[model samples]
Target: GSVVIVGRIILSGSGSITAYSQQTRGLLGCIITSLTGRDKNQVEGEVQVVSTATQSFLATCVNGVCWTVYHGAGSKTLAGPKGPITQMYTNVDQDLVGWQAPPGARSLTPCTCGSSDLYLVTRHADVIPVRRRGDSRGSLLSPRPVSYLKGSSGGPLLCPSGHAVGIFRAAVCTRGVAKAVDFVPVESMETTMRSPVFTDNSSPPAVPQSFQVAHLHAPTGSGKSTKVPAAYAAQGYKVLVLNPSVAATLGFGAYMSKAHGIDPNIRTGVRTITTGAPVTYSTYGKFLADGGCSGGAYDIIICDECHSTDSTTILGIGTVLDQAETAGARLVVLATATPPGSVTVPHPNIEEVALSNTGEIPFYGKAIPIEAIRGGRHLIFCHSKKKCDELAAKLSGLGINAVAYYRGLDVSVIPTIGDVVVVATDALMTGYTGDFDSVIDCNTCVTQTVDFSLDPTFTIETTTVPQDAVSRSQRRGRTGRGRRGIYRFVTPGERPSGMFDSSVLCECYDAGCAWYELTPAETSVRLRAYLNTPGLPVCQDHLEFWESVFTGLTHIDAHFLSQTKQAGDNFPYLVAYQATVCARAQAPPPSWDQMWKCLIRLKPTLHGPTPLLYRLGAVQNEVTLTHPITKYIMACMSADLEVVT
Candidate 1:
């Protein structure tokens, strides 16, 4: 007789378990016996205590029959932290053994021989394995296994066979390791599911059927505006549609009314956002900022031009969508000419009706010469804001005095009767196009992907929702409306063939290399107060602060080298952006001096030999030794990824 000695005490139950490779009963038990010099029977009577963040329970196995000593609902489906439980044996009404299936979960039932590549569902919904060290014991064990957390005592032991088998009973911790755990088997849960006390016989609904997110790739101008909402409204469903701007909002209400012959009252808006109308149309800004959809009181929430949504509004979009579903909205319809790269909580279904990418643009007037583009009322699009300013400077250098308007430019300050060429970037992608008689792309013209952050800490996550052909066509369409004006497109022949929709800055690892001197500038950029709802106290205060300190500049670089002492003109940029950054870092009044000093020390160490080696932050002001090249450029000082303009 050998003893199973454990370095870490295998008390009653420390429930929640991580995923691992599976081991047959004898192998792990034997290993334990070898390491501790104790046998299985010797260890079984000790009654180890398993505890997780949520619950604690006592576990013991007799003749391989594992049972938990706990009490809750007798013989009913027990839902632990991991998911929904399908069976629990309340042997004479005692809280015994069971498993939970994640919301819409189903059981694996048993097979003579189990499959491999198995997975375990833990409380975090993490897919880990049951045993960390071994290959499957072909034919010896029922199937490969996974683990569970404390409250996850009932989480299903799932496998690659695409279903769950045994209920996780308890963990076997060895003296030297904390990463792996061994489970005592239950053999079959059918008899338990059939037990008279197991009254909730309803198969543990399979896989979580929570809210869904799917891409919509419909053709341009395909009446998503009218018919989509009309169909829902006709169903007597209370539909809420989000338009991009006030004009779009007004136009949508009118268009829906005229096209669908609907009541103007039903086509409610900002003033009537909360009204119990059949359909409500409001600008996403007004709807979200006014707290219109905060409570999620609708049947369907529609987002028009979802890809057109910029980074500022993405957080509110994610938050409102969650609340919309929770507050009872059954379906969320995101209408966009361009589909987004990803979403937070994706929907279960998606509907798409799109045209292919190879189609010709509905081209307007012939291409105008680059020089001639500046003479008439026209718009010039550039790849970057710096490039736009360069073109404006070049025009000014020629004494043409063109006006440059990038995103976040002060609308009130726009010159009237200026009769100047409006050199621009994607800043002009949305909204009204004035009396521009032509449109031109300044060499580089693709609309870069939009970036966002739903993290309350503002972790600037970039999105790959590139400007789809549909929206690109829409921008072209804006040009010819006033008259058949020349639209000039400078195809990016010099640009690389397949540049990523997203990328992050990197530094060389070798200090002696040419790239070693280069350090990424800070990432804090000034964000316009999209909404300063004075009616709301928090919004009111936030707005007042912005008004008091902002310089109307959209983004100001907060790099240590470009601070007030060294770069006096950059003081405004540092303050506006840093203020917003401070507003988010709430541990205490963010010690700016301390944070600045921190960045200064980090600046030199950021450079390295390989391009990927550098210190980066996942969010502005926060520091990290390494970061990934991703669409979502969190915290990096490199212009390649920094959002600073």
Candidate 2:
């Protein structure tokens, strides 16, 4: 019995040649060249190629025998007991490709369990028993309660009598409640895989001769982001269009309606993904986390502002693309104004397009003295929200449609008509639909002060030079696309030096942005703590807890749990320790304040505090200035108010 190998050969003298192998072979004396550049500087030797059924099986080489290497036709070592196994080409579709276990290996035998229980192994690592029911949501072919989450789709539905029956295709969820699980039977795949070995079709669907993944670098107004999706939709292609920001999706929908004469029909409401219209636009983060990538295949996937491909929250989009491609969706288009170094399509099938800058800053600013002045609307890009509001309000009081656009408020809710002036922070930077006539970046972007008040002695924290040349370029990209728009920088005639460049700042700023809010359980904990306790517990601290738990913290500076001040103020980080317990034991959050009080009160009860956090709250015999001035002042204020109760 020989092993079934599924990997590419290195074909000698063709260092760059690579292809996925769907053939079975052995590994006794084959030379393996490392295709990856990992050991470029290290002295090394060849290793054996092991066969695997699982994706992670490549790491295990139980036999410890000689290796299998990448080689072209006629290396001639493939001989079995029956003589040399001749190379045979099969015209099999991807659906017709299936693996059979070697004679020695355990095989997945098709079985009919007379009266045994059945189970489904989910992608989330859950092994749930298939529940049969008489409910309307139940299925005769594949019966199951909708216990699976978003990532559970495509997982194997196994039999307790030991064989996979099918793959979990989807779960119907109505009003945030999972209703039932839909599955594709293994028998169906088996039927397809039993396709006859000979055919005229030679190429796999994924490896099309004309397949190309393009990175379209067009500035804000070049119309690629809007036009491409619409064009694909018009041609009757099913599209999975993604944008980093919700604003961008909203703008895309508007563009679809106005320019393409198409209605994206935006819906925050949940429905069947497979049952939807062809063109669906969603934020990459939302689509990655909970969208219906598992239902069926998409014809194309478009990533607006393609630089956001590096975003961690939406990284699952790559997995979605993989699944879609396996189901036969191939073409991918990435659009962005500024393509960062990370935005490259590495595969040979993906043709690289030079990062083009099609849009230029056609003009200049307000009554400010600056060079390279052009014209239209005077827009100012301020860093702080307060400053943006003040400027917008000042301009609006003088009767201009100077609406301050930012992240906290919903973009769709904002009143807008043609030619309204937008005074914005980074929030409006991505989504504003060439709406503004002119834009400006205030000096605060180079230097801004923040208040960290600790009573009589205030601690003023200053954030300096938030934007650099690259990030400033992205900001400028927002306006100029509308139509001969004006852009200006109200700097102190100097740029900030040192620290990470604009690219890094853009990433950091994106990291700081919150996608998820306080759940009812988390809200309960915070509201309870604030209501019962006497201290002025910050509700925002729980916001930090949820944010840190949901988002990456070590990479995000302010959200890092190791931050001493935040730890000291909030006491035990509940999410860090009692995450599972809190998630399971959620109490309804009745009121915002009460929930906050509960939040703080429950943290100490559920989790032990860190030494520094414990030390700060401890009754100190000789209290020093080592404690935060904010807490120190709080203590002092409480002490004075004690008319000795």
Candidate 3:
């Protein structure tokens, strides 16, 4: 039977070796270096200085035992059996060192479990059997030590299986008699093992290189507004971000300036635009009013929430695209979570970067748990502004700190911390970065059902329906940021069963939708129509006075009078008369109050108390007049009459 012999080595100082030399001065070291290939004689090529406190040196030999003194002669030979360095172990905390026998020399396996019987192999090649007592900071061995084990530091503490489980360090003495010994446990070496490997390439490129118009179609809370702009600004590009509201612009600017390390210039009012800033955040209205992007000014233009574009701003958005093209922008990004049916992009080169769904917050049913509500900040979303105000007040009455957030209200009142809950409408859906841990969606759609009767007429019945998938998903995206969050729906009393299915609650944004394209010619025609729209009437009396003047007049004479009135006067009363008649004939007739407000600001000039002029409220007696309108009409009547109050 083959037996494995765990060998030991001796390290000496730079001085001459003598029999009287203390083992502490000559130190003890084990052969811990591992071997290389199948060549039995070849060893691994490399020497490492594992410790700095021990002033010793190592030596290797092809045959017999070898040892080197600390900074002594490079190579030396000794008269002992071959002891090849193999596996190494070190315990930095306990100041211990250990080694294992090589494959050919390992007669006994390494100890996997604890043992009571052990032995200490010293540099003098003396083996002493020992018994385990307990561990106090380090492994403790019982029974008194002999005089020969004095300088046994750095030697192996072997288990009963002949495996080195610890390293000998020192001996405990009682009244000059050695009682026990302490050694570092070999298991502690795992905590101090160090490997030399480095990570070279791991991260992806920050931003893509594209010169076209990029449409970033991603779901809500995807960092399209923050991360995208910061990526461009980091590349030293001047970015112009058009937000939905003035508060959004301010919020984005402050956050980017503080968090992203970019110089943010916000355009909320007249003087907020700074020329030297790297990034400028502004509302679409302000950007259009300020004569939008100049040539070569901004490198990129980002229209955030582009899906919110409606009929009123469609032409203006086209004009913005035209301006961006003229400005020679390197890139234009139309970012939105829910893209509309169609988008009008004037650029020839357009690229859409659509991201996949990245999971959503789990729904907790209609009723929000009391634990989650009281645990962290919450956002309660409502469909209408009135509902937002009512819910906030109702919650506040229950001793909860609740506030309503809407378009006209200041955004600074929205709290970012604590157990405060905000009841808000869709105004807070986009560009808001408040840290909310829970979201309660109270929005529902209204669908009208037409019921036909025997009389051939129908009665229209309105019913509450579940909100669309896009809106519900957007509300859910508000919470669950940087941590776990809870999302719930509001229970409308009368609604279809299973209102919240996978279609409504779990549905994500469709990135494959087609973009509504608008050509240059169509955009021009719409812009012309917007500019050529007729102006509103200044005053009802002025329109009536001009209408009576042109009544029963020949066509030729009426045309001549209109041309003369337009060329000579600034009122354009005849044009206003036509506009008023046109406005009255529209399908859902315009409200008299709205029409009156348009005319209330202008004062009418009267020559006399003319019977041709009709009173404003006489035809529509149901309409009421405010103080300003009533005072203006009375002043006009008093100016026309001689003695009438």
Candidate 4:
């Protein structure tokens, strides 16, 4: 019995050659050389990597022992039993052809050449490396019979009942060259006493397989946030809220007491946190202690601007996570797309009840996508205070009730209520509330800080007059503060962009972006690069347009491939949308032919398929594929592509 080795190989070559190599290529090393640089053997000697596999890196020297380098996070080494071994290849295209192993797993070779040899093989996802195009060599003309010797590079062939799986070798160089058949010399491989293989026999004791995972979604006007908390409060759950910070934004978290009915702990109708001044860690703790768990059990916790947190703050969050799990509390965490990695607080046996990061929640709320608030929707983004005031006055003249929101005077004077007033960019759309339904946004983005307040207990409904609009990601964190409810806020407009993004929302999703190197989880997303333009549009949808924009210029898709719970190999169509208002774009077709071509072209822009997105039914109106902002939007989609098309 021999040992099963796993590692990565980094191949380079002194000279150029052309040849392709793969462990699952063929039964015998056929003319598999397709690269074009140097001899496969010299390329291997030069370490010119043609193709590579995960945790299968092998390097070689004139007289060095064969070594196996592990891939992924950490670096570890496995020394083979010889200097180098060269094994003749068979079936050079099994993997390419999708060869399947036998149905039943064969029993492990007993006795490690000892009990240690009892290790079983598993089919885990692995990475495959290939030579660069410039170094590719054509097929191998000559083939030869192979011999397995102790010191030869091919001493041990991982053959499952005569079918070769892996072979020992000092290095793998399949770049631009043809490699020779040399086995891994065993003088270097260390023969570790095999550990006894343990076969799992005892059935896993029946634990509660009853754990449940849920996701919540609704339209922009629906009370998803408020209703969710009310629905789950006190039912053995901890709640968390995350808020994204935006420039001059108000604090949405301060308002969660009234909207979704009321939980006893936070029923006082007091929205907003203590606004005297920012407190130190110690002081904040003491305040909490004095407050003595405002709500019932520690069921609900809120964090604003989840994407941004310092190392110390991260640890603080970890503590909260521990508490939630210990108390069996339903945790509600809120966050905006800013400071992407900060919201991560791992928990044991975690389950998500409702998650809405895509554009505006169907009937729920908004995330501030760039294209949000169109037509009668009310669009306002001013850079100066004076301008905001002037606009406010103009809005008032339009017969729409208007209010001003900003740092009105310092704390020493006017003592602003710190709440956004009702003022709509669109006069008729003045229904914009500083606070609406059960959604409350907390400002946590590092780039922005907010102090305005809104009704913490607003629910998503047409009648719910919003006291304010905390238009950012931070709003999602204000739910179930005391009762452990779902978070809510005015429907999100667009998730923030610019160096801020979130974890993939689910398993299968593809933004149609180019995929050169990808993780299994990321790859799991079933997204397509091509768009479907029924009309003869040139570009297809928003996502495709944006993705194409990024790839075309910077090769960056701000709204690139991500997770969506519904998507999986089981259903390839399930996918996620993008958040953050990074400004929308598209390249409208100059004519029907161009439009059709554009619509069908393979591109991935942020919002939706470029052309098709324009046709989607927005909360307030039906959009058209040829919007005014399409071109500039497309121009700015991703990072700068190598060249603009």
Q: Of the candidates shown, which would achieve the greatest TM-score relative to the real structure?
A: 3
**RMSD (Å) of each candidate, 1 decimal:** 20.4, 20.9, 35.8, 23.6
Candidate 1 residue 581 C-alpha distance from true site, Å: 11
lDDT of each: 0.38, 0.38, 0.43, 0.24
Among all windows of ten consecutive residues in candidate 1, which has the lowest summed lDDT? 504-513
lDDT for position 30 in model 1? 40
**Order by TM-score, highest first:** 3, 2, 1, 4
Off by over 4 Å in 3: 1-211, 219-223, 310-316, 340-375, 412-416, 430-432, 445-466, 491-645
Residue 288 accuracy (lDDT) in model 1: 42
Stretches of candidate 1 exceeding 4 Å from the true structure: 1-216, 230-236, 244-247, 250-277, 290-296, 340-376, 384-386, 393-402, 410-420, 431-438, 443-477, 480-487, 492-645
Residues 1-645 of candidate 2: C-alpha lDDT, one tens digit per residue: 122232322112234212222223333321221111011111111111233221111211112111111111111122222333322221111101122211232223444673234454443334566553421112324433333344343334445554545544345433224445545455545554555544321111132334345555554555666766666777777776777666566766766777787667443323223335677777755664453354444677666654442332223334343445455566656556544321111222222122122323211233433222222344556677776677667666655556676655656424434445566776664455444444566534533221222323222233545354335555555544535555555532222111122222222222223222323343333233322221111111122222222232222223323332233222223222222223223421112231123344444343322211111111222222332422433333221110000
Tens-digit lDDT string for candidate 4 (270-376):
22333222110111122222321234343554433322332112222333433434444344343222221112222122222232467531222323332322212
Q: Write the per-residue lDDT of candidate 3 for residues 1-645, one digit (tens) a residue.
A: 011112334322234221111222111222212111111332221111122122222222111111111111111112113543422432222433233333322222235667777676554555566676664112235444335445455545556555545555556543224556666555443333343222221121233354455556664456677777888788788888887666567777778878887668878653385747778888775665565568887878887776542222333444556666667777777677654221122112212111122222222133443344555688877766687777677667657688888665656555646568887877784435575767777656444332222111112344555554445555666766556666655531211111111111000000000011322233343334322321100001122211222331112223323442334321223223322332322211122343233332322421222121222212232222332322332333221110000
Model 3: residue 507 alpha-carbon error in angstroms: 30
Clashes of each: 65, 33, 8, 240
Better of 2 and 3 by lDDT: 3
Better of 1 and 3 by TM-score: 3
| TM-score, one value per model | 0.38, 0.39, 0.40, 0.25
